[PDB]
């Protein structure tokens with residue numbers, strides 16, 4: 001079990017009325033199986049107490065997804081802002097976007113995702129390709145492919 | 148090949164700021180304690196060696212110890228960081244070195260490359276003097292010492308390059 005990517009302060013907003021919750025986003029590979037996790041900060045930072053830890057409201061917000069369940073990544077990178085990505089799953093379940101902090105974190109995540117899918121999988125179109133630099137704000141759609 | 152470099156040091160000494168200054172040439176004044184681990188890649192050439200370094204940023208806070216220690220293993224060089232305006236962070240250097248050795252399980256601990264950074268050198272009101280820091284470095288393994296400022300870039304690149312240089316030296 002190895003860590004391919006980690007990023008603090010990835011926000012997710014469970015509903016549009018309530019403010020975004022900051023959390024840690026990680027990519028992990030155990031064998032050839034990649035899994036994406038997002039965990040609200042209060043569950044990492046030890047700020048719930050032993051007795052409440054097992055049934056905290058924040059456990060309802062934690063996500064863990066096997067990458068093979070993902071068919072599309074629909075990314076959105078506004079200038080002077082943080083990128084968002086929506087994972088589109090084979091099951092059709094609506095998932096809230098992850099929002100990255102300002103900077104090139106979106107691309108970095110896409111890059112570690114790509115580096116890890118190899119050699120059995122890859123992003124389509126490739127990150128290095130002309131199509132892979134999105135279309136103009138900026139909008140990306142990637143498919144995960146297994147040759 | 149791939150040269151893994153890890154930043155350790157008390158909360159708030161400027162570990163994240165150093166990585167971001169070196170990799171992206173940017174500085175943020177904002178307060179946020181790193182919780183989970185992160186890394187960035189950077190390529191450069193050193194003494195005619197073309198190299199990929201992977202810089203691992205970690206939580207400095209005592210309470211977040213279990214979130215950083217699993218990633219000590221496999222490190223090629225450790226950047227132990229303190230802030231020159233924070234004597235406590237300086238006094239913690241030994242404990243940081245001890246902690247790394249314990250969790251990284253390195254065969255030869257007194258051969259292992261450390262590089263020591265006294266960050267925030269742009270702050271004139273110091274609590275640690277240069278000679279004091281130089282003296283500690285010499286009496287605890289004869290490590291390279293750099294006075295750095297992530298805010299104004301002072302010696303930031305020099306420090307990371309020396310880390311690669313130290314790694315290159317140990318491959319023998």
Ligand SMILES: Nc1nc2c(ncn2[C@@H]2O[C@H](COP(=O)(O)OP(=O)(O)OP(=O)(O)O)[C@@H](O)[C@H]2O)c(=O)[nH]1
Pocket residue numbers: 156157158159160161162163164165175176177178179180181182205206207208266267268269270295296297298299
């Ligand atoms: N004046 C000055 N401030 C700095 C310098 N480096 C970092 N800071 C500031 O000090 C604070 C701490 O910065 P961080 O990089 O987040 O410290 P850290 O070591 O990464 O802290 P932890 O995540 O808690 O382990 C922030 O407000 C930074 O802007 C510096 O070189 N000079």
Ligand SMILES: [Mg+2]
Pocket residue numbers: 162163164179180181204205206207
């Ligand atoms: Mg930090």
